[PDB]
Every structure is written in C-alpha cells, then in structure tokens.
Write a protein that binds this ligand. Sequence first.
Ligand code: CL
Ligand code: CL
Ligand code: ZN
Ligand code: ZN
Ligand code: ZN
Length: 157
Amino acid sequence: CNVPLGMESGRIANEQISASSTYSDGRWTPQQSRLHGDDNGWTPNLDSNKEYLQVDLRFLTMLTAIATQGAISRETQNGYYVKSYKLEVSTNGEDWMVYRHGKNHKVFQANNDATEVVLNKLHAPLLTRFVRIRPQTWHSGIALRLELFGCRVTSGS
Ligand SMILES: [Cl-]
Ligand SMILES: [Cl-]
Ligand SMILES: [Zn+2]
Ligand SMILES: [Zn+2]
Ligand SMILES: [Zn+2]
C-alpha cells in the first residue's frame, strides 16, 4: 500500500493543500510544497513549532509513508529545511490526533540539507483523511516539500 498519493503528480489539487500561515512575500505558498517542485517550497509566516502544512486527501486513506525535502530559494540560493516533525491526523477535519507510539508523540527525523528526499515509513498503516506536517526543528528556516504514500480504503461503517 505504497502508492504516491498525488503531491508530485497533481492528483492532489491545489485546493486540497493549505497551511497555518505562509511567508508574507507570497513566494513560499502551500501549493509550492510538492515533492521535487522547482519553485521554492512552503514556508510559514513565522518559524515556530506551531506551524503546519495541511493536506486534505478527500477520502479515507491508509497512510504508509511520508517523504520530505527542504528547498533552495530561487532568489538567494540559500537552503532551508525541516530536521524533525510531528504528524497530526483527522478523519473529519475537526478531531485532530497527534500521531503517537503509546503516550509519546512520534517525532520523525527529516532532512539534513535542502535537496535530498528523506522517506519515513510508518510502522503500520495509519487511517486518515487529513494530514498535518508539524515542523519541530529546522535549519535556518522552515521549508518543506512533501509526498504522501498509501492506499484508499473502505470504512467499516
Ligand atoms: Cl520523481
Ligand atoms: Cl511509525
Ligand atoms: Zn520527481
Ligand atoms: Zn463537531
Ligand atoms: Zn508508528
């Protein structure tokens, strides 16, 4: 259950991608967070561990992996990247759960440069419709490009 879900391909439409905030110059929008995208990436308005990139998958989906990169600024050639993040999921867009192992939030180790893809496979598939990626640590600034992997599933109700 390991199919790219549509960040890089466009199957996830722009309207399905959103964020807590975006940098005030308009050059680092949520829609720039697609994996391998050639124009900057998503950056929030402020660098903090409360900001997030949100994706509505539209259907109930088994999430099995997350890929991330940072980005290089087109304007300055400086590199920005997330070093670790949490994941927060919801089937309805209202009830949000920060993904945990037992009582500990799972902290995914992410990038150590602006260009290489780091892939985190989940230990077991996770049911969700909405995904938030919530940077906890970063280098120089938050910047993200993303892919999500998994499969559509049938709800048991
Ligand atoms: Cl590719
Ligand atoms: Cl995991
Ligand atoms: Zn690619
Ligand atoms: Zn409600
Ligand atoms: Zn896990």
